[PDB]
Ligand binder design. Structure first.
Ligand SMILES: COc1ccccc1N1CCN([C@@H]2CCCC[C@H]2NS(=O)(=O)c2ccccc2)CC1
Ligand SMILES: COc1ccccc1N1CCN([C@@H]2CCCC[C@H]2NS(=O)(=O)c2ccccc2)CC1
Ligand SMILES: COc1ccccc1N1CCN([C@@H]2CCCC[C@H]2NS(=O)(=O)c2ccccc2)CC1
Ligand SMILES: COc1ccccc1N1CCN([C@@H]2CCCC[C@H]2NS(=O)(=O)c2ccccc2)CC1
Lengths: 467, 467, 467, 467
């Protein structure tokens, strides 16, 4: 039935005068765009404050408890020691700084009760089970774990006997690690200006003096786990914070709107399929009656719904970890803004470029299929050869990202210079390898990617012009 | 009337022999180019000296008054302290260095009178209004502000009692900030070689010990506000500086020339419109009789006039802030040099490229319209996800600039490496995100931008060749 | 004979139904891909541990024995001294740190016997043969070498007389170098968790205090040579490591499979040549009956075989140097993964891109022939001129890599800024040189490389479409 | 006369069989290439050693005489001081280190006689002519210069009175600079292994304590001027160095060969012009009978001749400055290697690319003419606006190089991030400016440069194919 199929394939701008139907579903989609974007913005702006407070407190803790800390971490660990005396100095510094906390800290910070309800410091050792050294070792396979609890009144003793205790004989040739752990209370007092009750915090802090490698270096890790707990005893005049109602009602509105959009899009797909079957049955156009933009909308609505549920759960349980909810909401927003291109396609000057991209994607991917085998071979060869001599080739994922950046011309000279001429064979191989890869990929593969795009544009343009 | 319309559409090189009219307006435009460029050059060369003197004095002040200053700022603040004793040491160092200024400074520098006409040092505290700590805080919402004035004869007292005063109990758990402020006189003695009277300066200096965050770190800000004031009592033999007459007369000349150019361009536009109406009335060419280069000239003349007025005002009032005047004059100069292309268009070999750019701009912008939605979605998603884990994604504008640089291949490997694998989910998402964005934008969008430019060139060239 | 030639030129997917022959050789090639890749992965993963242990021990040694070592090397040497007293302090620090090793080290480390079977420290001097200074030098051409052996019981003497010995008069104006050498035993105790017997190590350590240049700086080199030796006396309960059988049997399997693949590929080439001669003799197609992918397979199989033999030799002799074997195996793997493209060529959509690359390569190389002469001239000129004033132009290979990176837009602004304006002539020449090179190569040569690729794509595509 | 003109226009490969003439001039050109390249290589390799020795001695001097020198210069000066006491400490450190030189230096170094034939240290002061401070200055325009000579026996006095002398009252508010100057003898003893007599050196060293700016910072400059002088009294057994004969005879050979090549090329040009006039007179081809490669050869020969003369002069007068000779020889070598393309043009597959480049250059330059005006406007605007707030825009040449690097995508994100948001107006303007410039130049101008190159290639290829 032509009188209906043409109306279906039309645009909303024309339907308003072919049948004078108002485009309320387009208004629903615009409202969804606005509400999703504003929800994401509010969520990010609220997360920034909590993340900043936790990270700043962690930096202050590193400066307070780590001896000689320079303010920047050494890779995944804060600092390291190489001498038998440096380790003792760092451990005793951490303990002594814990003892004097009230006199040194600039924050609104204090001691917290541990799991045993004691206020104090726990330090643990892990040594091999038996222990002459280096020549006739008796070291057994399994480990012995020893811990001691030091309370504030123990550290206070005029002569801190604990420092002379038998516990601190570290026999570093058997040592696996030493762990220092304690709890601290905190308050995010900066929030007081809102007249809301300020958020308290509890920090679970651990210092790990790690020499699993037994290579003569101890790596020092500082970790802090922060929980909100409860502002249970404070006399700060003002008001409490029950804005959850407001935030929970906006999330409910977002969920409802996304649900409505999903229902309407699925209904549109069902109607299009009924039209397709009617066309198939009517008489002996293309099979693709399904509008592909509807699928993207359905995916985005599902992700937005589940991310909003996750956000409501996190707020209700007063959690402070946002990774999965952030991923869901951000991907939903990304797909929501991509879907705006559907409304630009209703105009001729914009449609040809969209059709050019649609024609471009498959052949570019089929050429990526060929390029990927050369890429894999080069990744394996660079990892196996240059890895022991180059920081950018240490492991396979770093190799892949280095090569991907190198195809785009990034950091090329540093990549060339970063490998020493200590081994002449490896240096010559590195020169051959880098020259071949960079030349082939930049000057041939990327040039064929430009040629394919240009040919797709020419094809689409000549189709649109000639008809 | 063809005998006039053709003459109007012609070029000045041909009018000199079709009607032997001399091209005095082109000479006026060339003179305007020369005078605007030389005014901008003189202005910048004069600004460099004042800016350099102020900034060098600020660096010397930071070295003089900030304890342990390394010579480079920590982001927007000069330095920071994390310990209760470091803050006291920094504050007392600032005060003591102020006391000893005459014995430490290498410059031609001295004490200045404050608003109260006293010579001395003012330091202020800002604490919460009530103050047990951390467990039962009585902290009220509003702040109490306390200040003390320390004169030179007070700091001189053999035993500097001020250091033992009750004022310096900082109760850091209530502390918002401590501010130290003072005035210094200075002389730009380097100018003496000109036999002009040297420019004196007054520096208003403030040191802010800031812990609004209450995160256990105090940020230390140093700020200096410099005013010229007057060289009211000096015996340096030589001559005074009244070159203002010279500078004010050149600015008047520039204003007059730009006014004449604006009047002539508006007259040309009026005459072109009269020609257009005469053509419309004559008989049953294109509607665009208005030369678009005239609009750019009018805009540039308006900006030059207002910027010259601003410059004259700044010099007359002896100010030292140049932002708005610099913007106006620089944009005027930029548009003036762009307008030289109009004179290259009078030659065939150059005209085709100008026409190619004119044909290129609209379709490139209409493709930018489609690309911008993908760009916005990626910006929001990267901000929400990678922001807590990546310095380049902390806030939305940084995200946008990072993505824009990334499309152009800049700093790609560092962008890949800058995000820790502490959270595996976020790391995998970052890899997917970066690969998708870089691949799509570099290998498809930029390739369609090259294809559009090439097609525009082919169209213009075949039009010019075939006729 | 057409009935056979067509079958020969066919694809394996079609032969399974034209003659129902199973493609067992393709299965052999897939098995070879899998086994080669897994062998390379296991080899790299095993090498990482040994390399990491050796390098970490070297870093710990540098921190232990080098005075004031900052944790990062100064180019090819660890550190340097410029003062007559700094050198003495560094030498005596190295000796004293050797004396106290058991009390300072964090690792499972101990003293090793030297070649003379003594446990101790050897230090050697190299001075000119004769020695007034600077005005009337009597310095002869040849050198005098003097060494002393210091045992542990000598260093222990309450008053370390050795420090006052006549040996340590270094007369630095005649000094070539001072060398300190010693042996250390070590254990890779981290491996104990496998219940395998841990790998012991012997480190041969040398410290070179080098002033061959006589330019007033002594360069300090630290080198460590590690050998496995034998875990001959240890009481660590567990099991020994005879997994060699497993690793040796997988290498034997890889060798056998590569040998079979090589034999089959050579047989296929022989059969193709017989077909070619039969075609030549039959009647008065192209001469290239040889499938070029077979040659790559043969090369890869030869490299894999020899690399596996090298790996087996290294493991049997318990060596720890992997450069040549890594090169052979990695290049073999790279060529193996490149050869997968042969299987993509059996599909039309992929074949056209392969043919485009094949058509592109020769003309791109013939244009590289012209570009290389300009490249060589610029390399020589930049080396001769900018070398004394620019770190990126010091020597010819650095010049070539800098120019290659510069063509790809890398580090351009730093390259411009890195040359001082101390000599105005050289600065102007550097500006002219850099602008000319960058402009010519980026905006003309790379543009002709894009044009050649596009023309090759157009030719291949129109051939495939039109037939 | 066709029988001669065709032979003239031919190639040497064909002349060997059309007339069997041997191509001895091509052999002369090949010999010239070889000899010029080897002369340049020997020259650079010999210069490297002298430059390295001088620079290493300068670094050792900076470490010896500059207090607290970190091993890296602060821009154009080695180090700086901001305090009245730091300057005194640095000056007295320099003098005391000079006094103790024999006990601290690691090199073959000693004291040199000054112009007055004394061995000692000269230090000079420059103050304003009159000198209350800051309030009523009596400072006159002109300067007073005061110097004192300190000999070794003066510095030796048990109590170094000189340190208490009235000379060292620096009245820093009048101070322009303090200069310390001395001479040192040196020997390049590393050359002794050649059995040649070693090269002695004399270093003229000056330390400038500079505060011309009077901004509260003193900049400390160290400069060293090295001359060879004569190895007039040394007992080092071996042989002298008279290899000059060898080097002077190779330079004479190069001069002779370049002269012969120049004469032959000019003769060829004269013969071509006679052919052109004969063609013009014969009958009523193109006017360009002159082979353009001959002009390049003549220029290269002239530059090689004059550079060889300069090199011979420098060696004869025993100078150590090579800038102008290096420029001449390097440019000669660059043009010599570019001229090899003439021999590639004798082959069809290479000729089309050369013709493509020749056709490309003019239209690319005519588009550069249009692009340069936009470039100039942006340079002026960025200098005037962003200069006070951005290190990359401080002065016009830095602006131009920054923009040129920015067009090529280098350092884009750092350029965006390097400007503070202290002034919001300037920050917004910087964003607008950077986005507009980068977008316009990368996505439009560079795309038209690619289109012009492709169109030139298509034109040349279709001309060569169709005929
Ligand atoms: C969105 O995706 C694309 C859109 C358009 C064009 C290409 C792509 N791709 C890009 C690369 N990308 C892979 C990402 C993971 C690393 C390996 C890449 N594969 S690669 O062919 O070897 C390759 C490598 C460097 C440059 C170009 C191609 C695949 C997607
Ligand atoms: C002068 O302007 C242009 C002249 C010619 C071509 C393009 C542009 N444009 C460039 C980008 N520019 C926007 C600037 C602000 C950030 C977002 C940009 N938009 S974008 O399409 O997403 C995009 C992003 C990366 C690369 C290419 C396009 C718009 C102008
Ligand atoms: C695999 O190889 C290539 C595949 C496809 C296209 C080009 C190449 N080549 C690239 C360069 N490469 C040489 C490597 C050693 C330095 C000199 C290079 N030669 S260059 O022409 O002067 C040149 C220089 C810069 C940019 C482009 C061309 C040769 C191979
Ligand atoms: C050898 O030269 C060229 C060979 C082929 C193509 C272009 C050039 N040119 C490049 C630029 N170059 C000028 C160098 C000095 C700075 C200004 C440049 N001019 S620019 O048009 O504004 C411009 C700016 C950026 C990118 C492209 C063009 C001129 C030569």
């Amino acid at each position: 039935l032509r009188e209906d199929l043409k109306f279906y394939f039309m645009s909303p701008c024309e339907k308003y005068r072919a049948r004078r139907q108002i485009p309320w579903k387009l208004g629903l989609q615009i409202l969804k765009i606005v509400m999703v974007t504003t929800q994401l913005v509010r969520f990010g702006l609220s997360n920034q404050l909590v993340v900043a407070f936790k990270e700043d407190n962690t930096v202050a803790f590193k400066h307070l408890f780590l001896k000689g800390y320079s303010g920047t971490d050494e890779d995944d660990y804060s600092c390291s020691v190489y001498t038998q005396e440096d380790a003792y100095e760092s451990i005793f510094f951490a303990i002594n700084q814990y003892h004097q906390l009230k006199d040194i800290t600039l924050g609104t910070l204090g001691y917290g009760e541990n799991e045993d309800n004691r206020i104090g410091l726990k330090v643990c050792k892990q040594h091999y089970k038996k222990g002459p050294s280096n020549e006739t070792l008796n070291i057994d396979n399994d480990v012995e774990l020893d811990c001691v609890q030091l309370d504030l009144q123990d550290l206070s003793k005029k002569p801190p006997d604990w420092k002379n205790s038998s516990f601190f004989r570290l026999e570093f040739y058997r040592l696996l690690q030493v762990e220092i752990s304690f709890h601290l209370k905190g308050i995010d007092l900066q929030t007081i200006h809102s007249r809301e009750l300020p958020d308290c915090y509890v920090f679970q802090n651990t210092i790990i003096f790690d020499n699993k490698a037994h290579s003569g270096k101890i790596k020092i890790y500082f970790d802090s786990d922060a929980k909100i707990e409860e502002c249970k005893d404070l006399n700060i005049f003002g008001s409490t914070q029950k804005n959850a109602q407001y935030v929970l009602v906006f999330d409910a509105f977002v969920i409802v709107i996304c649900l409505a959009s999903l229902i309407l899009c699925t209904r549109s797909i069902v109607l299009a399929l009924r039209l397709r079957k009617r066309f198939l049955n009517f008489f002996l156009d293309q099979w693709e009656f399904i509008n592909g933009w509807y699928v993207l909308v359905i995916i985005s609505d599902l992700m937005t719904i589940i991310g909003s549920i996750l956000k409501m759960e996190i707020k209700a349980k007063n959690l402070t970890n946002y990774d999965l909810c952030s991923i869901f909401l951000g991907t939903s927003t990304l797909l929501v803004w991509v879907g705006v291109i559907r409304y630009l396609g209703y105009f001729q000057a914009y449609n040809v470029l969209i059709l050019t991209m649609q024609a471009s994607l498959p052949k570019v991917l089929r050429f990526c299929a060929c390029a990927g085998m050369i890429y894999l071979g080069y990744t394996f060869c660079g990892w196996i050869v240059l890895g022991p001599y180059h920081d950018k080739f240490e492991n396979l994922n770093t190799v892949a990202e280095c090569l991907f950046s190198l195809v785009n011309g990034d950091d090329m000279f540093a990549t060339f210079a970063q490998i020493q001429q200590k081994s002449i064979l490896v240096w010559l191989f590195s020169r051959l390898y880098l020259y071949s890869f960079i030349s082939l990929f930049i000057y041939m593969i990327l040039s064929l990617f430009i040629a394919l795009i240009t040919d797709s544009y020419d094809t689409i343009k000549k189709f649109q012009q000639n008809g």
